[PDB]
Design a protein that fits this description.
eight-stranded mixed beta sheet; 1 helix; globular; 2 domains; mainly beta; Immunoglobulin-like; Jelly Rolls; about 0% helix; about 240 residues
């Protein structure tokens, strides 16, 4: 099993005080991975995630290291401070604009909806003029228990840098909704794995600017509503993907 102290040099926390986006990153081998823990819940097992902290103050993350042999007994705790409270945030890029999303073939959303990691029937959805509308009868308690992968035929090049935005709304308070722009072939290859809490009926814009390009033949846009309260209705609208 990994001894967690050995991986202190491999864990970096980047606080952008101008955007209020904290990037959590780990460098490791094809087999080793971190487990990012906030408020005693698994948030991500990916090599990096980006989380929006709206309010100013002191926050904490706990990092365990996992391989094939098991998870580390102890966790690395890392403290960070958010300077500002963003009342009026960025509203995203032009949804209607000359966006790569509008051009490309957007497949129907697949679902993996599994309270207690036991898959039930796909939740009812309604794609009407770009606006995705999803309804979650059953409550889930963990990330990746309400997945919504959207397959696309969008290719990207190493030569270019890309911008992305999306507006997310929830009828009930949600602790952690995920947005991941990932290679359809390779799960480890992605531009970001976003994280943001949602307060009832308050649209949050998730975005990233000037993202280093990757040689990907086909992208998938993967949402997750793991941790949703029972009767939660999700609203995804204004999905912009453009060259910087």
């Amino acid at each position: 099993i990994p001894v967690v102290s050995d991986y202190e040099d491999c864990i970096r926390i980047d606080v952008n005080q101008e955007t209020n986006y904290v990037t959590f990153s780990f460098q490791g081998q094809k087999g080793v991975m971190p487990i990012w823990i906030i408020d005693g819940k698994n948030y991500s097992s990916s090599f990096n995630m980006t989380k929006y902290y709206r309010k100013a103050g002191d926050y904490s993350v706990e990092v365990k290291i996992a391989n094939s042999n098991g998870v580390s007994d102890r966790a690395i705790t890392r403290n960070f401070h958010i300077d500002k409270t963003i009342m009026t945030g960025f509203g995203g890029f032009d949804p209607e604009s000359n966006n790569i999303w509008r051009t490309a073939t957007i497949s129907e959303p697949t679902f993996w909806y599994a309270p207690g990691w036991s898959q039930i029937a796909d939740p009812a959805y309604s794609l009407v003029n770009g606006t995705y509308t999803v309804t979650l009868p059953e409550a889930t308690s963990e990330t990746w228990q309400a997945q919504m992968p959207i397959k696309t035929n969008i290719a990207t090049d190493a030569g270019k840098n890309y911008d992305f935005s999306v507006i997310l709304t929830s009828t009930i308070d949600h602790p952690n909704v995920t947005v991941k722009l990932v290679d359809a072939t390779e799960d480890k290859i992605y531009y970001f794995e976003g994280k943001t809490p949602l307060v009832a009926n308050e649209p949050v814009c998730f975005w990233k600017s000037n993202m280093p390009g990757l040689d990907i033949a086909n992208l998938n846009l993967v949402f997750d509503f793991g941790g949703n309260a029972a009767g939660t209705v999700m609203t995804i609208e204004s999905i912009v993907l453009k060259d910087h």
